[PDB]
């Protein structure tokens with residue numbers, strides 16, 4: 103691609119600059135270029151990749167929701183549908199790009215729990231974003247999200263402590279999948295509660311800084327439980 | 332361009348949708364397509380054009396400032412300069428596009444004061460944005476901004492009341508030009524004060540709604556005077 | 561809408 | 568930085 107001539111280290115440096123400048127499309131392109139060098143990613147690099155694409159797809163999701171809401175009102179000319187479709191297609195292209203990087207070849211080279219769980223969670227997340235706009239096929243997309251989350255959960259429970267921030271963010275997002283995508287609010291509530299309680303019981307093992315990291319994510323579990331019950 | 336096959340009315344409708352979705356790059360492309368249909372723009376359409384490109388160039392200016400600040404610190408590898416140059420070049424391309432639309436052929440077909448002043452102010456604004464990143468050539472860019480603002484001012488003083496929001500926003504931006512670009516802080520202060528005082532004395536002629544519109548812009552003149560003195 | 565993992 | 572016209 104267009105980043106093939108740039109050094110890996112320069113791509114990472116520029117991704118960090120783009121983050122500081124709130125240029126998330128650039129940040130994603132730089133990190134895509136870094137992935138395509140073929141070397142595994144460090145913990146920091148994995149998070150740069152995630153931050154970049156989360157911001158890109160987050161803007162698209164917010165736009166899609168606005169347009170879909172306008173479209174649904176109009177059904178209570180073709181321009182509203184056309185433009186919602188345009189944004190939707192762009193969003194799906196971003197998700198497909200991320201899923202392609204995970205499949206070629208981030209996941210298969212990831213052996214440590216922290217990397218493998220991170221990437222499988224990401225695969226669940228971007229199939230979930232595809233599911234949010236899918237209509238009927240929606241079933242196979244939902245199953246793909248579920249499968250990725252489940253594999254990630256199984257590894258995280260075996261290999262990580264209950265306060266691990268990757269484990270917590272995985273359980274959080276899988277609970278959102280259950281509530282928002284899979285029409286399983288009881289599963290969502292059960293998962294959030296068990297995750298929160300098992301992390302609570304492990305906090306005593308943590309340093310002050312790790313305690314801060316874990317409790318910040320636990321608060322999101324609690325906020326969802328408040329909304330859901 | 333890529334919007335050549337879309338109806339003018341559909342482009343305007345989609346520009347308004349993109350605004351609601353905070354998709355300002357799309358909004359600008361739609362309004363560029365509408366301009367390129369060759370018909371003059373209504374007051375609402377002129378403001379859609381301005382809003383779209385102001386948001387696009389505003390993100391680029393904010394990014395450029397972040398990167399330039401990092402670059403200047405590093406001079407107290409080539410990546411910081413390279414990436415600042417990338418953003419700078421993109422910003423200049425956006426300014427050139429807007430200036431091209433004004434020159435081909437919005438300004439020459441604009442006969443009413445409200446349209447002609449609006450477009451000449453816009454020409455001043457986008458040359459000012461070019462001036463912000465220009466280095467030495469900077470002189471001819473500054474002169475182009477000054478010339479456009481001055482022509483707009485001369486028409487506005489002859490043809491518009493002192494509370495007209497276009498006249499006020501023009502005087503505001505020309506005062507910013509004087510202070511920030513032209514190294515003429517006394518000219519900036521004098522212009523802001525005279526503009527504010529002449530608008531104040533005309534407020535009694537206005538409806539409640541027009542009064543609200545004018546006083547909102549006057550507050551920006553006052554806020555600058557507070558910062559400048 | 562439910563809260564998902566933040567950056 | 569000085570305030571310019573807003574939308």
Ligand SMILES: Cc1ccc(-c2cccc3cc(C(=N)N)sc23)nc1N
Pocket residue numbers: 121145146149150153567
């Ligand atoms: C050396 C290092 C390791 C990990 C992280 C990290 C961890 C979790 C989230 C996140 C977001 C980041 C970002 N928005 N740049 S880094 C990062 N950071 C480091 N510096």
Ligand SMILES: Cc1ccc(-c2cccc3cc(C(=N)N)sc23)nc1N
Pocket residue numbers: 350374375378379382574
């Ligand atoms: C019918 C009409 C005429 C003028 C305007 C207008 C005026 C000044 C600024 C601005 C921003 C706009 C926007 N962000 N869409 S419209 C607009 N609006 C209308 N509806």
Ligand SMILES: [Ca+2]
Pocket residue numbers: 288
């Ligand atoms: Ca129940």
Ligand SMILES: [Ca+2]
Pocket residue numbers: 517
């Ligand atoms: Ca003085």
Ligand SMILES: [Cl-]
Pocket residue numbers: 184185188345
């Ligand atoms: Cl469209």
Ligand SMILES: [Cl-]
Pocket residue numbers: 116413414417
């Ligand atoms: Cl670059």
